[PDB]
Amino acid sequence: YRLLRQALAECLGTLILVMFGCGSVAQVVLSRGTHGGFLTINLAFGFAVTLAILVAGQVSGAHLNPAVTFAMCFLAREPWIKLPIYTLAQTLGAFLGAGIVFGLYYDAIWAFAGNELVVSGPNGTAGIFATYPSGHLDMVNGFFDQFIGTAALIVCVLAIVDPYNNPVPRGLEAFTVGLVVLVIGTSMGFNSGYAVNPARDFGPRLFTALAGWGSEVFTTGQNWWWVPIVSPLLGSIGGVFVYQLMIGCHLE
Amino acid sequence: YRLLRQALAECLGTLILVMFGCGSVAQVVLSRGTHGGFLTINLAFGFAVTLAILVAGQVSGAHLNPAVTFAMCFLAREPWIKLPIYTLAQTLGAFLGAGIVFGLYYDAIWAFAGNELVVSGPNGTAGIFATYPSGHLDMVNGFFDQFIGTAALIVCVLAIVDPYNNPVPRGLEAFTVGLVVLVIGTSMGFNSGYAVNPARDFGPRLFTALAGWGSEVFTTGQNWWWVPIVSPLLGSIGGVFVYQLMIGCHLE
């Protein structure tokens, strides 16, 4: 089965992304103002995209993003059967990637707030794995940034993928996509890294629910958990229309 | 119409540059000493050039700069009819790019100085979109830096564009130009990023005039608004002569 082979590559690619990305977030959160700031988080997350794509690029195409996979299926470049397989493979591996980071920082995470696991607050460790609303980043405000961020990512991704343009040699597509991830985190109001990936958000968040943080990871922030899933899905559609209207429909 | 197709690519490319660039400036200005310093602003602006060129490079040549377009027209490498079309397309998209950043940070920008929009001062938000004079960066002083910065950018750009040299494969021209933008911001006295682009300056500045900042964005700094337009236009001419005299005229 060729589909199973691509799913395994997607799972390994997302495992590298989450483990390498959330590990840098853990160092910054646990070591308050000691191991750098948000620049290291975005640089590590951005460079993790390049490494993950270089590993699983030749096998599954290195989507590593349900929004990216949805965009290709919308453009009829991939079968619709790949959408559930890739999303399940991308979610399974972000769940596994968060487990490795939890094991690496098991002693430090439990000692952040004494001997208890707190979801949100000054002594909050659940923000290492999943994104949570800020003071000015409420549900209405946070929906717009994810829509814009995903649309920008889709437009840049489709530029290096369209067959009408000259083929891009291997070793530059990975860096280009990784450059977008680093730039998006720096620009948009999200200090967690790759906040436009539905698999990178729901995966680790589901792990924290069973790891000991409880069900409060889903019922906090006025039920914020579904926003980083629906919003990038709609942003990918908008990004496809923006690119097609400006560049895609005229490449004869 | 082929010209219309190139104009759309230029508008999209400048939209990516301004939205990704001014978004990082907004985070630094609004979060005073929290989301990094000037290194993040220059890195985000420099990497935004690479992404914008990689998107619109194959369609319009990825000028994204009225000074760069003027240099090509001066060297007779492009028709003079492209100068008004590209400048209008580059300005329209910097205006649109600033609107996206304004929408992203609408709540934070309005709360910077209470419930009012101030152009200049310690509680100033108009500096996110457009450049304003500093204490040692007056009209006479600020004219020289933009002249030198644009001349350096033109010389570097013409090195990778001249047909006499070996053709540069796609995926390295974008990074080379982006490297110049990051270096120029670090070297010259401008903490806003890409301060040598007439479209990146007048575009967002015009948006702030209608967004609510008033007409003071044009009548402040002893009428500074026209400097980041005239000065890079003259610097591009000087950069063309410097490159042609040293390298261009001898490439037989």
Place this chain on the structure above:
Amino acid sequence: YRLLRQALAECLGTLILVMFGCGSVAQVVLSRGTHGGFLTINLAFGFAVTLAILVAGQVSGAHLNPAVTFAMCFLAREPWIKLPIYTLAQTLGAFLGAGIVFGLYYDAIWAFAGNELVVSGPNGTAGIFATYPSGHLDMVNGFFDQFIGTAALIVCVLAIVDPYNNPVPRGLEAFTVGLVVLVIGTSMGFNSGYAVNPARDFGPRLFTALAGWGSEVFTTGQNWWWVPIVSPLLGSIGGVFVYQLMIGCHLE
């Protein structure tokens, strides 16, 4: 003898890595909070891998890591006779690389704690050359990070090396491996850089034993010296199985 030629390249490559890497660590440790933080250490160590690979890549394959060499021998891609030759060549050159750094900072190192050489503590200089346990990085905790870090490095390295994939042009393999080293240091809990290299650890540590620090460099931290040797050796085996099971065994 072809084997002797490859050993000389490995010694020179590891000499460049340790001298360029440990030199940045010396500046940060000696200049407490003056010459940057851990970002510079990881960037210098990561970029040193790229330079070392670009130098000795065409002669010996640019392993520069006993764990990497062990992985190739395990996969039957290299003869088992190369394992002792490369390990000796990699250790000899990390010993020499630490000597250059010691000579460069001879006056500053001796004046860190007055006129004495201290192994561990606030006035500790032995941490420039070798890794030492932290408060939350004990022998049991530190074993797991090195196992995970080496496994991640092996998986990424094998992706660009497998002959079934398209050959990678020279000039991108060096940067890809250097990217992994920078990312691993940022993610895992190690503020020394390239903490998954057995030669980079035992080599400089052996130098400090004879340089004047005494035998305490081996008997401190509950005999921590053998951990950065055994743990990456086991992690390389795990990384080989992870890559082969997911990608390697299906590349037909």
Place this chain on the structure above:
Amino acid sequence: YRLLRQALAECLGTLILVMFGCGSVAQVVLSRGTHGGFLTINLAFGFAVTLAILVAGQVSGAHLNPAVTFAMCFLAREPWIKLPIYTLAQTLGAFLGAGIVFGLYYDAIWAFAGNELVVSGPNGTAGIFATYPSGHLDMVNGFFDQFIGTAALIVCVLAIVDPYNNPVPRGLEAFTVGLVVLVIGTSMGFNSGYAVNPARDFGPRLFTALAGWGSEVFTTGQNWWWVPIVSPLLGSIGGVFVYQLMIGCHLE
């Protein structure tokens, strides 16, 4: 005359390097702890090498270093007549590059210490253009770092230049050399950037002598001015022998 054409390219390349490099140093020195630290200085200097090489690479080979030119002449790869022409062309352009930086920061430099030009001290501006000894960086100590730094640069440069290896495509040689410059500044004890270039040191230093700083720029630091000239010249010879003995003499 072909030799005159190469000299003009070398002058322009060194002009880009010094103006882009010393401009970042001026911002850090004048804005005490405001425009970043030593990371920006090394990043700007390192990236300036890449831009300068990409401009003058196809015309003169992009040496931009008297030590590098001396190494090629020693290896009989270039005629000995090129040594005085390139050194004069490299020095003329570092003198011109420092003049542009002086004009850019004329008001800020003169106001650093009131209304006077001081060579050394807390209110010292002569360190922007030329290197000066530190507390632990005396003449004997500073000689060794420049010898080691130049030898490391020569070894890395010769790796990508030797014809026996596979030719390096344009667009990667510039980045490789620029990577060495950034790494050397971070590793060795020099917070000025590219402290192993005789032209980058004597050129701007000579400008300060006539700009108003007086002859004290040559008679300070126990006559330190000749060290950054003799030491890299000897280091280039040592770097050539190190590379030839290990790799060069065995490439059959």
